Structures are given as C-alpha cells and as structure tokens.
Amino acid sequence: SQEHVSFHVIQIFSFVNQSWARGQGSGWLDELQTHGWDSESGTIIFLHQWSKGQFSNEELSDLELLFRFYLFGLTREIQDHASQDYSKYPFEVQVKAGCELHSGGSPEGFFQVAFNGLDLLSFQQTTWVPSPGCGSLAQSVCHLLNHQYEGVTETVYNLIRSTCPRFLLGLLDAGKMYVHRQVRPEAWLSSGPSPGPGRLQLVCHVSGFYPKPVWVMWMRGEQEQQGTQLGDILPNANGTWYLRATLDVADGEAAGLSCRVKHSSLEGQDIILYWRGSLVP
Amino acid sequence: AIQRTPKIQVYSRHPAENGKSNFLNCYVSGFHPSDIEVDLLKNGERIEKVEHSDLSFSKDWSFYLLYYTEFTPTEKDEYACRVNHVTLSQPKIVKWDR
Numbered sequence A: 001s002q003e004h005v006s007f008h009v010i011q012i013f014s015f016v017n018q019s020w021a022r023g024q025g026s027g028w029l030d031e032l033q034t035h036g037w038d039s040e041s042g043t044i045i046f047l048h049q050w051s052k053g054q055f056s057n058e059e060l061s062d063l064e065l066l067f068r069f070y071l072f073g074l075t076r077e078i079q080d081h082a083s084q085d086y087s088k089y090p091f092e093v094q095v096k097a098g099c100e101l102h103s104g105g106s107p108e109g110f111f112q113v114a115f116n117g118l119d120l121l122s123f124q125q126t127t128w129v130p131s132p133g134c135g136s137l138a139q140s141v142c143h144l145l146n147h148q149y150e151g152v153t154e155t156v157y158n159l160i161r162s163t164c165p166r167f168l169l170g171l172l173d174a175g176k177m178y179v180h181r182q183v184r185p186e187a188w189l190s191s192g193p194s195p196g197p198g199r200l201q202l203v204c205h206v207s208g209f210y211p212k213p214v215w216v217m218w219m220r221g222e223q224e225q226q227g228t229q230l231g232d233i234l235p236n237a238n239g240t241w242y243l244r245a246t247l248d249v250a251d252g253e254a255a256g257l258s259c260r261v262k263h264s265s266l267e268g269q270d271i272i273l274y275w276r277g278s279l280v281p
Numbered sequence B: 001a002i003q004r005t006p007k008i009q010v011y012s013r014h015p016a017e018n019g020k021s022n023f024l025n026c027y028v029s030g031f032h033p034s035d036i037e038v039d040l041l042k043n044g045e046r047i048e049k050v051e052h053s054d055l056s057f058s059k060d061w062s063f064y065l066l067y068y069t070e071f072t073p074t075e076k077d078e079y080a081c082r083v084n085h086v087t088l089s090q091p092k093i094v095k096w097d098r
C-alpha cells in the first residue's frame, strides 16, 4: 500500500468555573475509534479484541499512569492561572496529538491545541509554536512549555515520534483480519425531494461497503450522466460506509437510467439497478 | 470563533423492509460549541437503547457525532433525529422516510 495511516488521541476539556470542569478523551486509528477513557477510574477502554496493539499489559498500565499524572497536572495549572484571571470562564480546549506514517515509512508527530475552536498553538519539531491568531495567551503558554516545564516536552516528543508509530503498526498487525477484510455493498433506489414541477430526483443508496474506495454513477447505457451528485461518504455502525448518488431529470427522460456500483469486493461483477418509478403499472 | 450550526444526516443501513431488523443512523457534524442534545425518536418519543460515538472534531475544530440504534420498521411507526444547539432557537428535527 501507498496510503498514509494515522493514530490520534483527542481530548476536549470544558472549564465552566474554578470548581467545575468536564472532559472527554478517545483514541482513533484513521477515522475508526479504537479507544475510550473511563474518567472515574482513569483507565483505558479497549473497544476491540485487537485494541492492545501488541503492547504488553505493563506498558499499557504505565501509559494509563502517565495519562493520569498528565490530567492532574494540566487541570491544576490551568485552574491556578484561570482562577486569578477568572473573566475567561466558560472556555473549551481541544487537543489532538498523534502521528502519521507516510508512504515510505517516515513518521510525523502532531500536537495541536485550540481554544474556543481557534488554533492556539502546536508542537513543531521541538518548539512550542503559537498561532498568528490571539498570540499573547498562545505566547504565554508556549513560553511556559518551552522554558518552565521539565522533561514534559521531552516526553511529548518521545511519545508522538516513537511510541505512537510503534503502537499504530502494532494495532494494524494485531487486527490484520479486520484491517484487510472486504465487505460487499448493497444498493437500492428511491425518489428524492421534487426538484420542480415536471421533474424527478433519483437517488441511489450504496451501503455496507468496506474499504472506502467506491465508484457510483447514474448511467444511460455507457453514457455516464454528468449531473450525478455524490454526497458525503457517511459512516455506518460496525466500520462500513454509506453513500447517496442523486440525479435530477425531467419526467419523460427518466426511462433507461440506471445506477452502477463498482467496488473492490465485487470481483468485477458490478451492481446495476434500473429506475422503475411510475413507469411500471 | 463564530458559532456553527449542526448538519444532520439520517440514513438506514438496509432498505426499509417492514418487519425486518435494520439500523437507523444519524450523523451530526460541523457544530461549535460542543454542547448539544441529539436524540433518536420513535413516534415522537426518545429512544433509550441508543449508541453514539465519543465526541470528536474535524481539522477546522468543529465537532461531530454518529448515533445509531437497531430497530424494526412498520407502516405505523415513523422515526426521526432531533437536535438542539445554542445556534438553534427551536429543536430541529429531521425525519426518516423509506
């Protein structure tokens, strides 16, 4: 394969005042959620049979411990500074940390942060870098981390650049039968919202396919109809995908139109559905 | 950051087959801030047996959630997804049709 894969942990913290806050963290392999966080017991929730990713229970309990210390220290500092400057409440922090594996095996680390939905800072190579927007707060936090916080930055560098790629690849190998499976889509047709008097909206639904690459078109014979509109490839429960293809046509020109579906699981034999509509008595 | 209203997309795993197990999905994305009320409705009543993803956000930092529930449709019963946000004066609804 030539494709980039990535792993991320994401956090969302809301601080309403100095005595009340709440948070949420999770782990994601590409767009697939593979981990949660139980906040009462401070432990990792493994969503799949392969979610330990060939890590030993020892490294994992040590990561849980590390995350617990990190959460404690993070909230304690933010509250020390925001209680004095209490005009900031209520506010929301977004964190996204993790790594990407490029096609030749080169790892790339990531640690981005946002404040009320705006880029606040990031971690470029070895330096905490503020964003152009805001500065100040960004510059403050960045100086704080650059010069006033010990092996914290060292540990973050080691975590996003060595521990993360190793866990990514261990996850992929631990679930290879899930990772490399093929799942056949099923398709069906429906009408859509009326585009206007004397006009029809044809919809082709394609659902349950994995992996994500798919080809779906409205056709007349071998003429692909240029008007086909593809929707977002939406996620299903249990790792499959869903897709709508719609087409607007005058009634009287709808006969002969068909939906065609091409997917890796189909062994060359495409799915074809002819629009019937009100044509058949 | 300018508040963003949720996009709500409702869709089933399988073709509607009256008297057949099926999954109803509701994808809610592009909203900010993160506080939100999503419910799946059967005949205007909130379904409790539901599953949802943990909160996640795109690269523009707007949030998104997948909701789903297993169900069996009939001509009598209609299903919906209801969302309430700060950017919403009245709880917005999206209805599911065969």
Ligand SMILES: CCCCCCCCCCCCC/C=C/[C@@H](O)[C@@H](CO[C@@H]1O[C@H](CO)[C@@H](O[C@@H]2O[C@H](CO)[C@H](O[C@@H]3O[C@H](CO)[C@H](O)[C@H](O[C@@H]4O[C@H](CO)[C@H](O)[C@H](O)[C@H]4O)[C@H]3NC(C)=O)[C@H](O[C@]3(C(=O)O)C[C@H](O)[C@@H](NC(C)=O)[C@H]([C@H](O)[C@@H](O)CO)O3)[C@H]2O)[C@H](O)[C@H]1O)NC(=O)CCCCCCCCCCCCCCCCC
Binding pocket: A069, A070, A073, A074, A077, A078, A081, A082, A083, A084, A085, A086, A087, A088, A093, A113, A115, A137, A140, A141, A144, A145, A149, A152, A156
């Ligand atoms: C392990 C992992 C590692 C850990 C990761 C986490 C680390 C990184 C993040 C943590 C740090 C973030 C960066 C922070 C940097 C900081 O350096 C700091 C320095 O900036 C300044 O700080 C000062 C703190 O002191 C503030 O001053 C205070 O502000 C307060 C709120 O505004 C009050 O202000 C008043 O509010 C009032 C509301 O009722 C009024 O409106 C007042 O208005 C005036 O009132 C008048 C009345 O007549 C007139 O009307 C006048 O006209 C009018 O102007 C106003 N008064 C003003 C403007 O002067 C205070 O004023 C009082 C008050 O009222 O409480 C007055 C009292 O009398 C006084 N009592 C006495 C006896 O005298 C009292 C007390 O002494 C004070 O000490 C405070 O209690 O304070 C004042 O002090 C400044 O704003 C502020 O800018 N910057 C900050 O952003 C702090 C908050 C940051 C929180 C973090 C947020 C997000 C964090 C993101 C983290 C990212 C994570 C990355 C992950 C990394 C991975 C490893």
Ligand SMILES: CCCCCCC[C@H](C)CCC[C@H](C)CCC[C@H](C)CCC[C@H](C)CCC[C@H](C)CCCOP(=O)(O)O[C@@H]1O[C@H](CO)[C@@H](O)[C@H](O)[C@@H]1O
Binding pocket: A007, A008, A009, A025, A026, A027, A035, A036, A037, A044, A063, A065, A066, A067, A069, A070, A097, A098, A099, A150, A151, A152, A155, A156, A159, A160, A163, A164, A167
């Ligand atoms: C949803 C769940 C996800 C599950 C998937 C598994 C995740 C997969 C496998 C890997 C992915 C990694 C992700 C990509 C990156 C995000 C990690 C998070 C964001 C940041 C963590 C770093 C913290 C900032 C703690 C560093 C500070 C301490 C301090 C220095 C080191 C000693 O520790 P300590 O124990 O405190 O020990 C310390 O030793 C020091 C002595 O030098 C002392 O200063 C301290 O007092 C203390 O004793």
Ligand SMILES: *[C@@H]1O[C@H](CO)[C@@H](O)[C@H](O)[C@H]1NC(C)=O
Binding pocket: A016, A017, A018, A019, A020
């Ligand atoms: C802090 O926020 C919590 C959550 O809303 C609230 O119950 C509590 O009263 C707040 N404290 C105040 C407003 O002093």
Ligand SMILES: NCC(=O)NCC(=O)NCC(=O)O
Binding pocket: A013, A014, A021, A022, A023, A039, A040, A071, A075
């Ligand atoms: N800074 C918010 C935070 O991380 N709180 C710790 C925690 O465990 N929160 C769970 C909750 O109360 O929502």
Ligand SMILES: NCC(=O)NCC(=O)NCC(=O)O
Binding pocket: A039, A040, A041, A042, A068
């Ligand atoms: N490791 C536990 C923690 O830091 N916070 C959770 C807690 O103490 N209580 C859960 C709650 O109040 O919701």
Ligand SMILES: NCC(=O)NCC(=O)NCC(=O)O
Binding pocket: B050, B051, B052, B053, B054
């Ligand atoms: N908010 C905690 C949680 O349960 N997150 C993920 C999830 O799967 N929820 C499904 C449910 O219990 O309704």
Ligand SMILES: O=S(=O)([O-])CC[NH2+]C1CCCCC1
Binding pocket: A009, A010, A011, A012, A022, A023, A024, A025, A026, A037, A038, A039, A067, A071
């Ligand atoms: O509030 S809360 O449920 O404690 C949020 C937990 N976030 C953590 C997830 C795993 C490591 C990064 C921090």
Ligand SMILES: O=S(=O)([O-])CC[NH2+]C1CCCCC1
Binding pocket: A029, A030, A031, A032, A179, A210, A211, A212, A213
């Ligand atoms: O179909 S696809 O979802 O684009 C495949 C690539 N994404 C990853 C999903 C979870 C397992 C590793 C592969």
Ligand SMILES: O=S(=O)([O-])CC[NH2+]C1CCCCC1
Binding pocket: A008, A010, A028, A030, A031, A096, B056, B057, B058, B059, B060
């Ligand atoms: O806009 S976007 O390209 O879809 C951003 C990608 N979201 C991923 C980031 C963190 C883990 C969840 C999946």
